[PDB]
Amino acid sequence: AVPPSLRLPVIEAAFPRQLHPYWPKLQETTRTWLLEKRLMPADKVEEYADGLCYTDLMAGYYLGAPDEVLQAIADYSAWFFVWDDRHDRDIVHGRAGAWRRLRGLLHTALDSPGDHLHHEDTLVAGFADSVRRLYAFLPATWNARFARHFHTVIEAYDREFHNRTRGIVPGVEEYLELRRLTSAHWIWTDLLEPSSGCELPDAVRKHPAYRRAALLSQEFAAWYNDLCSLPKEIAGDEVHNLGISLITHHSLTLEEAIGEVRRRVEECITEFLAVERDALRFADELADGTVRGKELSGAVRANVGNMRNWFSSVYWFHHESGRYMVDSWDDRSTPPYVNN
Ligand SMILES: CC[N+](CC)(CC)Cc1ccccc1
Ligand SMILES: [Mg+2]
Ligand SMILES: [Mg+2]
Ligand SMILES: [Mg+2]
């Protein structure tokens, strides 16, 4: 039962949930990886990792992925949540130096992950392990594109560090541009490709229908996160959330901002429904009779199907994951799964 302010009847009726058959093994394997890479204290792994639903989130998204690809994506994604927690704690504790050094190491490790597999900072070592495995699936050009996108993500996290230490809430348009990077829209879009076994040519993945469908799936994910994570974020003095930009810069009340964010999320859905028709027509056109055409057609179709699956996976994740259950915490400003 989804809270009325967060309920999206269109998702519930028209975006049926999917689950990858590897999910049971994925759940345990990622938990063991968090333990073995020392990315969370052992007691917090035992108590909270399964309830955080990070593997469920990816298993409801990259359907069809080879099991090894899904494992790498799930480990990376769990790493990414831990990194968001580290960034938050560095801000709260004023650790500008520790953050700057981590930022620098992530840039270096992203270009040379093998050199960082045993780094003294386990967060860097964990990042490097997941990235080295993601780099083993597709040609170096895909790896270069993932790296180019994630260098930009790291710098967006640095900008968030600047904003929060200075108490600056970005304007709405500034926020929307920044959120495409902090939510890592283009990373999740990149990762559709190893999940369907094909690096797409630029001419295919830049087709306007593929680009627009990919954008809308990610805007929904990020803004629905903003809608559902607003209570934890207000309680933790987070400033990055579309609702906060609207309350601060447009003088909306909390109820008005929640309504405006919900309307924007709803529009992502119906805009996606329109463009999905064009993206699937494009998939059909690629099947021109040749072997290569069949390959590209099947890959685009699988990727657009996963852009759809992201809507339902993100929707239910926010109601299942312990990450957002601020009402259950003794200290609303300090989530119990974070290392404080
Ligand atoms: C890895 C999770 N993420 C995305 C970058 C950072 C903490 C937040 C998020 C969760 C779920 C949906 C959209 C964004
Ligand atoms: Mg966060
Ligand atoms: Mg964040
Ligand atoms: Mg959030």
UniProtKB/Swiss-Prot annotation:
It is an enzyme of class 4 (lyase). Mg(2+) 2 binds at D84, D88. Its cofactor is Mg(2+); Mn(2+); Fe(3+). Its EC number is 4.2.3.37. The keyword Transport does not apply. InterPro entries: Isoprenoid_synthase_dom_sf, IsozizSyn, Terpene_cyclase-like_2. Keywords: Lyase, Magnesium, Metal-binding. Pathway: Sesquiterpene biosynthesis; epi-isozizaene biosynthesis. Signal peptide: none annotated. SUPFAM superfamilies: Terpenoid synthases. A motif (DDXXD motif) lies at residues 84-88. It catalyses: (2E,6E)-farnesyl diphosphate = (+)-epi-isozizaene + diphosphate. Mg(2+) 1 binds at D84, D88. Mg(2+) 3 binds at N225, S229, E233. Binds 3 Mg(2+) ions per subunit. Can also use Mn(2+) and Fe(3+) but less efficiently, and other divalent cations such as Zn(2+), Fe(2+), Co(2+), Cu(2+) and Ni(2+) are nearly completely inefficient as cofactors. The keyword Metal-binding applies. The Asp-Asp-Xaa-Xaa-Asp/Glu (DDXXD/E) motif is important for the catalytic activity, presumably through binding to Mg(2+). Catalyzes the cyclization of farnesyl diphosphate (FPP) to the sesquiterpene epi-isozizaene. Belongs to the terpene synthase family. This is Epi-isozizaene synthase. It comes from Streptomyces coelicolor (strain ATCC BAA-471 / A3(2) / M145). The gene is cyc1.
